[PDB]
Amino acid sequence: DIVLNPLGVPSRMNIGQILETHLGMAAKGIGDKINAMLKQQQEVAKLREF
Amino acid sequence: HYIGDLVQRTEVELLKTPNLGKKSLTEIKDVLASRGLSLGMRLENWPPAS
Amino acid sequence: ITVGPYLRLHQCGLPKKMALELFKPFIYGKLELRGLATTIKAAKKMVEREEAVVWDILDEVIREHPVLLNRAPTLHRLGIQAFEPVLIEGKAIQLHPLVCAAYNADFDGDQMAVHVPLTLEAQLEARALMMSTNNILSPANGEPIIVPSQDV
Amino acid sequence: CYRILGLKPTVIFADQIMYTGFAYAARSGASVGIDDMVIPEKKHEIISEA
Amino acid sequence: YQGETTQTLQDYLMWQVELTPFSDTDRAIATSIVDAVDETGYLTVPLEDILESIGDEEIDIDEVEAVLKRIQRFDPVGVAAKDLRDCLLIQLSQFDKTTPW
Amino acid sequence: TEDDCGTHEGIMMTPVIEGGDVKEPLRDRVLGRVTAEDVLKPGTADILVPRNTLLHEQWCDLLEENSVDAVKVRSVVSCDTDFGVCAHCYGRDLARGHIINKGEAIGVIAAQSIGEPGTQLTMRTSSIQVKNKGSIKLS
Amino acid sequence: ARVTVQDAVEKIGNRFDLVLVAARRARQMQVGGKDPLVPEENDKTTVIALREIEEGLINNQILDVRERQEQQEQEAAEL
Amino acid sequence: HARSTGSYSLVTQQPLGGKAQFGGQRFGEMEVWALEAYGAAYTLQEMLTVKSDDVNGRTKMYKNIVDGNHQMEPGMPESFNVLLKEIRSLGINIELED
Amino acid sequence: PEAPHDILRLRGVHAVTRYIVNEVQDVYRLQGVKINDKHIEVIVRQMLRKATIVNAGSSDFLEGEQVEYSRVKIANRELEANGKVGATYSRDLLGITKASLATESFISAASFQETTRVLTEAAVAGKRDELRGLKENVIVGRLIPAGTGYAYHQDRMRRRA
Amino acid sequence: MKDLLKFLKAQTKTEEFDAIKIALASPDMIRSWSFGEVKKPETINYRTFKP
Amino acid sequence: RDGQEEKQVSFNSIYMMADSGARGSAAQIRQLAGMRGLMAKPDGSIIETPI
DNA sequence: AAGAGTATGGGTG
Ligand SMILES: [Mg+2]
Numbered sequence: 001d002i003v004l005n006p007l008g009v010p011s012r013m014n015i016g017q018i019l020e021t022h023l024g025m026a027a028k029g030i031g032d033k034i035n036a037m038l039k040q041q042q043e044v045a046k047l048r049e050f
Numbered sequence: 051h052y053i054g055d056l057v058q059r060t061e062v063e064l065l066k067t068p069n070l071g072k073k074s075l076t077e078i079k080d081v082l083a084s085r086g087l088s089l090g091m092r093l094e095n096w097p098p099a100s
Numbered sequence: 101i102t103v104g105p106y107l108r109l110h111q112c113g114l115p116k117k118m119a120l121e122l123f124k125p126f127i128y129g130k131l132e133l134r135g136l137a138t139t140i141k142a143a144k145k146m147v148e149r150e151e152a153v154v155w156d157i158l159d160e161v162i163r164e165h166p167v168l169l170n171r172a173p174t175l176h177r178l179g180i181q182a183f184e185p186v187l188i189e190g191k192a193i194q195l196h197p198l199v200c201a202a203y204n205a206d207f208d209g210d211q212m213a214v215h216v217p218l219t220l221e222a223q224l225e226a227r228a229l230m231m232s233t234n235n236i237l238s239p240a241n242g243e244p245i246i247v248p249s250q251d252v
Numbered sequence: 253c254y255r256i257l258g259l260k261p262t263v264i265f266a267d268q269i270m271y272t273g274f275a276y277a278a279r280s281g282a283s284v285g286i287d288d289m290v291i292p293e294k295k296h297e298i299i300s301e302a
Numbered sequence: 303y304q305g306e307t308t309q310t311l312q313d314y315l316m317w318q319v320e321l322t323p324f325s326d327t328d329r330a331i332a333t334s335i336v337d338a339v340d341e342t343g344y345l346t347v348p349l350e351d352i353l354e355s356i357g358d359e360e361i362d363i364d365e366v367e368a369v370l371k372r373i374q375r376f377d378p379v380g381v382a383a384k385d386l387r388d389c390l391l392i393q394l395s396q397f398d399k400t401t402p403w
Numbered sequence: 404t405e406d407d408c409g410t411h412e413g414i415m416m417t418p419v420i421e422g423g424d425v426k427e428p429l430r431d432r433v434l435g436r437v438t439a440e441d442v443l444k445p446g447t448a449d450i451l452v453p454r455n456t457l458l459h460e461q462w463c464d465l466l467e468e469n470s471v472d473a474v475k476v477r478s479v480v481s482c483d484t485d486f487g488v489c490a491h492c493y494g495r496d497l498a499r500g501h502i503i504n505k506g507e508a509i510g511v512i513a514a515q516s517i518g519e520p521g522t523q524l525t526m527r528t529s530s531i532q533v534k535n536k537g538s539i540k541l542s
Numbered sequence: 543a544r545v546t547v548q549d550a551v552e553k554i555g556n557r558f559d560l561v562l563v564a565a566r567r568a569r570q571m572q573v574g575g576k577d578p579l580v581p582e583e584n585d586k587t588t589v590i591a592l593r594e595i596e597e598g599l600i601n602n603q604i605l606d607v608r609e610r611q612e613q614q615e616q617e618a619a620e621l
Numbered sequence: 622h623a624r625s626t627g628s629y630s631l632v633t634q635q636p637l638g639g640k641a642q643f644g645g646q647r648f649g650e651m652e653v654w655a656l657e658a659y660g661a662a663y664t665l666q667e668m669l670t671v672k673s674d675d676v677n678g679r680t681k682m683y684k685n686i687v688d689g690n691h692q693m694e695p696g697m698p699e700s701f702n703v704l705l706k707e708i709r710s711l712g713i714n715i716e717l718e719d
Numbered sequence: 720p721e722a723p724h725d726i727l728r729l730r731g732v733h734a735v736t737r738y739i740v741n742e743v744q745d746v747y748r749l750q751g752v753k754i755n756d757k758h759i760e761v762i763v764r765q766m767l768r769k770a771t772i773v774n775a776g777s778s779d780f781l782e783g784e785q786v787e788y789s790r791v792k793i794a795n796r797e798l799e800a801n802g803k804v805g806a807t808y809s810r811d812l813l814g815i816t817k818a819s820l821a822t823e824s825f826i827s828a829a830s831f832q833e834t835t836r837v838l839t840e841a842a843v844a845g846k847r848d849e850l851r852g853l854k855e856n857v858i859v860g861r862l863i864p865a866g867t868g869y870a871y872h873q874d875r876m877r878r879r880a
Numbered sequence: 881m882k883d884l885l886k887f888l889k890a891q892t893k894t895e896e897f898d899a900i901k902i903a904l905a906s907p908d909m910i911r912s913w914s915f916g917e918v919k920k921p922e923t924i925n926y927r928t929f930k931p
Numbered sequence: 932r933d934g935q936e937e938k939q940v941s942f943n944s945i946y947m948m949a950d951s952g953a954r955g956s957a958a959q960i961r962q963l964a965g966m967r968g969l970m971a972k973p974d975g976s977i978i979e980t981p982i
Numbered sequence: 983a984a985g986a987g988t989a990t991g992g993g994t995g
């Protein structure tokens with residue numbers, strides 16, 4: 001969706017955005033797993049286990 | 051022969067033309083003013099390619 | 101101001117909504133000159149309606165006519181420079197990347213002002229004295245001021 | 253270039269330099285990640301000695 | 303404190319007079335005519351008063367008539383009319399002949 | 404407001420050296436200025452650069468090839484022109500590269516040049532050891 | 543002219559004098575009814591004047607000579 | 622925001638300020654210094670008289686631009702006359718000479 | 720530390736110029752700022768504008784009055800051609816704030832100084848402003864005597880005499 | 881002025897000057913400046929809305 | 932090319948940005964990947980325990 | 983009887 005310049009990170013020393021980007025990637029991955037499990041109707045037991 | 055030819059001519063040129071007094075020039079100005087026109091207008095690319 | 105990466109050093113990007121208001125009497129004269137309008141009120145109404153021919157007229161009247169871009173605070177004479185406009189869509193001014201260092205400008209909220217020279221002397225002064233293609237060296241020390249930076 | 257050849261070639265050269273730099277910076281794919289900030293392995297030993 | 307300038311009917315009329323190809327005599331006549339226009343758009347004096355106010359005897363009444371006819375086609379149409387009939391006829395003369403009635 | 408006042412005065416430019424570190428070479432202090440005296444070769448009395456020469460890159464290269472030490476140049480302080488200065492006491496126009504023209508508002512340029520970098524300055528708060536091999540002079 | 547004016551500056555020798563001469567020639571072309579000495583290619587009068595100056599066809603002395611010759615011709619025709 | 626012409630102050634006869642008033646941009650002292658450092662005298666004079674407070678110059682410039690004749694006829698700014706009147710109101714005789 | 724006034728009085732103009740230039744460049748080099756030495760020199764030249772007469776000589780100057788250096792040098796070079804003797808003097812060093820307060824134009828002074836004091840003193844003295852500077856011509860909307868306007872001021876000057 | 885053309889041409893003239901003079905003003909100079917004497921502190925009638 | 936091992940200049944993104952002069956300096960990289968160091972009290976005196 | 987030092991007021995930001 002967005003393209004940001006990596007040249008603005010090192011001199012500003014605001015490293016929180018990189019960690020936030022990584023953690024948001026991980027959260028979206030978990031959400032994608034759940035969505036794929038929901039699309040193909042699976043048992044409630046597998047959903048609650050994951 | 052056309053209004054575009056007439057409006058490009060100035061008052062001085064009409065006055066210097068033979069057989070044209072001040073009364074006829076005033077009449078021409080009056081009839082042009084009746085249609086919202088005047089003497090002394092400038093046009094580019096005339097005659098209009100016809 | 102936004103960044104124009106495609107521009108040449110002597111060019112700037114001007115919105116046409118601004119340019120229509122800035123060059124209004126020039127457009128009136130050009131409309132009256134080629135027979136589209138017979139009186140001043142006809143040209144005024146035609147420009148108010150923003151018909152399709154007024155855009156051709158505007159593109160014809162700004163072809164070679166410099167404009168002055170200025171950013172505040174003006175610390176040295178490089179804070180005002182002359183550029184040739186290119187009509188663009190939108191509402192933001194596009195700036196050449198190589199002049200920003202002279203303006204001390206960045207694209208995170210900065211605004212710029214634009215002025216139009218009127219007389220022939222002003223236009224020739226803008227072309228011969230204030231054009232960015234003439235302001236290559238620094239008047240303070242004689243070094244180049246259009247050096248590349250960052251991404252380049 | 254300015255001292256040897258003059259003004260106009262310098263302007264053309266500057267424009268070409270900007271174009272080429274932008275193009276190849278885009279092509280490189282340079283990015284910033286958390287693993288780029290490499291910590292030396294002797295930092296804790298130096299701190300302990302101090 | 304200070305206010306701002308406002309454009310009246312006479313200011314608009316003089317702005318249109320400025321950008322009209324008049325001669326010096328015609329421009330002076332137009333200035334007098336616009337001076338003799340009230341806020342409803344009607345002429346308040348006869349053309350004899352304007353001719354006397356011009357101040358020279360080389361000018362006839364038909365030149366004043368021509369200048370008045372040119373002015374009456376300014377915006378708004380029908381301004382500087384002598385009377386109601388003149389204003390109505392001036393407004394009608396700007397309509398196309400395809401009008402039904 | 405003038406081209407040449409005809410003066411022969413000037414100031415002596417030498418490299419700025421503190422201790423053993425060279426803070427400023429000569430070429431960075433005489434580039435674009437006009438010599439107020441004939442430049443002589445260190446070893447002889449032969450003239451190297453004549454009087455009233457605008458020192459551009461070629462002349463500076465010639466100076467640094469022959470190891471010229473100090474150069475006398477014209478300055479606006481010792482200018483004979485009243486109500487203004489002359490072109491030769493000022494020298495090169497830094498923004499253009501050639502000599503200055505008549506009718507230039509150099510005072511405004513100087514004030515702007517000094518004041519523009521003023522935003523980068525902070526407002527709020529035993530033995531001589533030689534390094535190279537060379538002759539020793541005592542003054 | 544369209545990008546840089548270095549050649550015209552070298553021809554005239556001064557930027558201010560160049561601006562003055564170019565303005566005089568441009569006003570001659572725009573309002574005086576004169577025809578350009580170079581083939582105009584969708585150019586404004588200022589750029590045409592600059593191109594004429596950089597080609598060596600226009601300077602202050604030439605303009606003065608032309609003006610004096612035109613005045614002499616007008617006064618001869620008046621007689 | 623942009624402006625060609627518009628309304629002016631009653632006293633100073635200069636363009637108003639602000640987008641809501643359809644005003645113009647301010648050309649301050651530092652911009653004047655920049656123009657002086659360039660040596661662009663005609664641009665500065667045009668900015669000082671026919672664009673701000675030369676009442677007859679504004680109209681003449683507009684008419685000339687519409688006619689296709691890019692030439693100005695500069696006059697005296699009105700703010701200078703206001704200053705002269707204000708200084709005279711203090712009991713001091715200040716006048717233009719010759 | 721040595722005061723610049725004593726350097727000017729004992730060593731001369733060149734030494735104090737070198738001292739001021741070197742000090743300013745030392746302050747600016749700590750931040751890595753490149754400024755040519757010309758501009759500091761023109762500022763110093765504007766600082767060294769006055770001169771104090773030490774002997775009246777054949778001129779009409781007083782015993783110890785302080786006046787413009789250009790006037791003194793013009794008078795001395797005029798007298799020296801007539802076989803007379805000029806007046807000796809000593810250069811003076813002032814700050815920029817005090818140097819700018821010695822301008823000979825009350826319009827220019829009132830533009831940026833204390834308006835009331837300047838106007839009162841000018842009205843008492845009955846002064847007359849010739850409109851020779853940039854700011855004075857900016858106030859009245861004329862061409863500045865610099866750049867493209869410079870020639871315009873020359874012809875006028877040669878149409879007055 | 882009788883001729884309206886010259887009358888209109890005469891009200892758009894620019895005064896010529898080359899110097900500015902400043903001095904003190906005598907009572908006679910102040911009286912020569914004025915067109916009349918103000919005697920009342922009222923400004924607007926507020927009934928006819930006239931001065 | 933022969934299967935040996937050599938040492939060359941790094942292609943690390945932060946090092947490439949700093950070495951080319953595009954963005955950043957040595958002190959900022961030290962703050963990013965090494966200790967931040969000693970700080971100062973508002974008066975100006977150094978705090979004996981660094982970050 | 984002058985001359986150096988201190989307190990007060992004006993101006994600037
Ligand atoms: Mg910003």
Ligand SMILES: [Zn+2]
Binds near residue numbers: 407408483
């Ligand atoms: Zn000199």
